[model samples]
Target: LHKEPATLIKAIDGNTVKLMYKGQPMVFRLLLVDIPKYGPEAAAFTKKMVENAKKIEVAFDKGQRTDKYGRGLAYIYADGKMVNEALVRQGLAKVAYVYKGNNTHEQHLRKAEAQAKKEKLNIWS
Candidate 1:
């Protein structure tokens, strides 16, 4: 339930971003979203999402607050849409690298991943 408004500072890749959260620059890993690999295509996709969104928000889960690199773990929202889930549905994300206690969207993400695979979307293609 720890959610906050965040502005996009930089999108390192499809699943990682530097944000202006709480008036401070912080990096965050999009929880449950594992981009197949961080490359130009993924980076551009992330950049475009924020570019089109009028606003953005971040929501932290109950467990595993941060990663080993000290980056925050969160679900990024662009114009109220869950970017983490959107990436998976697009087949740009594989929905992996989960640590613990943040399964709230596990099935939800997995389902999108499945559909993407079935549809042969993006990387799956």
Candidate 2:
């Protein structure tokens, strides 16, 4: 019935954020992009990332503004680093690259993901 929990939503930019709520883990996401299998953990980490973020930004190049599922799709940045790349770097999330429309941070994301994998940060571990 419209219950707003004490959730901390650190907006990295206009769309992206690192969401942190009481009694929950950390999660992060690109406010506008849609990955196939995201969970609450991801969302929670997003909040933490935003909270601890040194820099963050957002940008839009393509996509239908809003997804049919009612979620906005845009590029995400954290502490001057791409959110996607950060996720992979921190070993908090995986490389679920779906959209490949002139990816601005694709290379960095992949490189970070690889590093995380080697370090056992995310799925690779």
Candidate 3:
């Protein structure tokens, strides 16, 4: 986990965020989760979360880092909680990509998605 502290610059969509890291703008795609388009509630939730965040910490998988777009694939921690997990738990996202052999949070994300589906939360409703 990279412990670099960052601040929210903007939300590109539901799962992608632009952050000011080390005084430079960086893009991060929430790892292990996928959200719907920008006009959906999922995006709204993410926007609210990022807008209210005071600080954000980005954590990458053991060896995986960037995606094809060069955006850092990471789990974002805001207000001491993993935003990726939160999105899944809230039914705003679904478990999407897991690294081939070293998916650290894959299990947790899948479980959260299952629970959200069971409860019919948000997008699952």
Candidate 4:
């Protein structure tokens, strides 16, 4: 995982965001999670989640860097919390891709999805 910190530029959707990485703009897809198709609420929720976030940290998977769209795939953190897992736990997203050698984070995402499912939150409802 790269240690570089980024600033949230905008939330493209529930699972995608634009950020300022190393003084340049870049797109980042939240790793290991997928939300509903990009829509108003999804975008709005994402905006709110990262709103007021001064500094957001992004960590990429070991071997994977960018997706087919050229967006950097990463685990985002804001306010010391993993935003990827937060989205799953809140039912705003579901565990999607689980890359090899990233089992620890994958397990965490799965557990978050389970909790959100049990609670019937957001997308789970």
Estimate the TM-score of every prediction: 0.92, 0.56, 0.89, 0.87
Global CA lDDT of candidate 2, please? 0.50
Could you give candidate 4's per-residue lDDT for residues 1-125 as a string of tens digits? Answer: 45568888888887789999989999998888876643565667667777767668988778567877898988888866788888888887888866645444888889989999999987787
Worst 10 residues of 2 by lDDT: 1-10
Clashing pairs in 3: none
- lDDT-better candidate, 1 vs 2: 1
TM-score of model number 2: 0.56
Pick by lDDT: 1 or 4, better one: 1
Which numbered prediction scores highest in lDDT against the true structure? 1
Q: What lDDT does candidate 4 reach at residue 24? A: 95
Question: How big is the positional error of residue 57 in model 2, measured in Å on the Cα after superposition?
Answer: 2.6
lDDT of 3 at 37: 38
Candidate ordering by lDDT (highest first): 1, 3, 4, 2
> At residue 53, what lDDT does model 4 achieve?
75
Relative to the true structure, how large is the alpha-carbon lDDT of every model?
0.85, 0.50, 0.82, 0.80
Candidate 3 regions off by >4 Å? 36-39, 100-102
Considering summed lDDT, which 10 consecutive residues are worst modelled in model 1?
34-43
* Model 4 misplacement above 4 A: 37-39, 99-104
Candidate 3, lDDT over the whole model: 0.82
Q: Encode model 3's per-residue lDDT on 40-72: one tens digit a residue.
A: 777778888888988788877786688778888
Give the clash count for each candidate. 0, 19, 0, 0
**Comparing 2 and 4 by lDDT, which wins?**
4
